Amino acid sequence: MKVTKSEIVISAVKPEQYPEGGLPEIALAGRSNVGKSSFINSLINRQTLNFYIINDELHFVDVPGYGFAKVSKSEREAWGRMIETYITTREELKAVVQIVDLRHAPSNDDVQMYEFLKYYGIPVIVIATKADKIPKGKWDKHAKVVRQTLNIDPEDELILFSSETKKGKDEAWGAIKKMINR
Ligand SMILES: Nc1nc2c(ncn2[C@@H]2O[C@H](COP(=O)(O)OP(=O)(O)O)[C@@H](O)[C@H]2O)c(=O)[nH]1
């Protein structure tokens, strides 16, 4: 997608705050510091659920990074409610881009998130980023580990990505498009 417009529209602490209009939504989730914000900025050339209007045709919905253990119990609880509410009630949601680090096996938190999404029948685009930190010759090895750890559904997608080199950008947009026009 040639992005000519992208800007935050709301930072929702509650579902009442979600934007109206009914445009398709693609939510993004991953471990804190995995490279989610870098992934977003790459695609568009640049305690709340943040909605970004893209080209006035869809919203990216950025979910606060998970797996950061130095968080209060109340914050973790709030995070859980927020995502559970969103995932289970949002009709506009077409897919979640789950971003993981290609360098290592996905974590227990990644697996939990993936299992949660599949439980609710949510289409997922798995992005394994930081690919540039691994020799090209090992990309397949590391991708196989990601695939087997999450046990990725064959209808989901696994795309290797790098915010450094923009590897995966076109493929990621292409997948978002398939998900939106399902
Ligand atoms: N080498 C490399 N570094 C990356 C990549 N993506 C993110 N980073 C770096 O990893 C750190 C965390 O990335 P960031 O997008 O801020 O993480 P976020 O917390 O998930 O939003 C930053 O220092 C980024 O520069 C990538 O694909 N390749």
Curated annotation (Swiss-Prot):
Checking SUPFAM superfamilies in the record gives: P-loop containing nucleoside triphosphate hydrolases
Q: Which residues bind GTP?
A: 30-37, 62-65, 129-132, 161-163
Q: What happens when the gene is disrupted?
A: Essential for growth, it cannot be disrupted. In depletion experiments cells become over 3-fold longer, are abnormally curved and nucleoids condense.
| One GO cellular component term | cytosol
Q: Which UniProt keywords apply?
A: Cell cycle, Cell division, GTP-binding, Magnesium, Metal-binding, Nucleotide-binding, Septation
Q: Which Gene3D superfamilies match?
A: P-loop containing nucleotide triphosphate hydrolases
Q: Which residues bind Mg(2+)?
A: S37
One MF annotation (Gene Ontology) recorded for this entry:
metal ion binding
Please give the cofactor(s) recorded in the UniProt entry for this protein. Answer: Mg(2+)
Biological process terms from the Gene Ontology for this record are: division septum assembly
List each copy of the EngB-type G domain by range. Answer: 22-182
Cysteine pairs forming cystine bridges in this chain are: none
The record's family statement is:
Belongs to the TRAFAC class TrmE-Era-EngA-EngB-Septin-like GTPase superfamily. EngB GTPase family.
What does the protein in this record do? Answer: Necessary for normal cell division and for the maintenance of normal septation.
NCBIfam families, A to Z: GTPase_YsxC (TIGR03598), small_GTP (TIGR00231)
The entry's other comment says: Estimated to be present at 1000 copies per cell.
What is this protein identified as?
Probable GTP-binding protein EngB
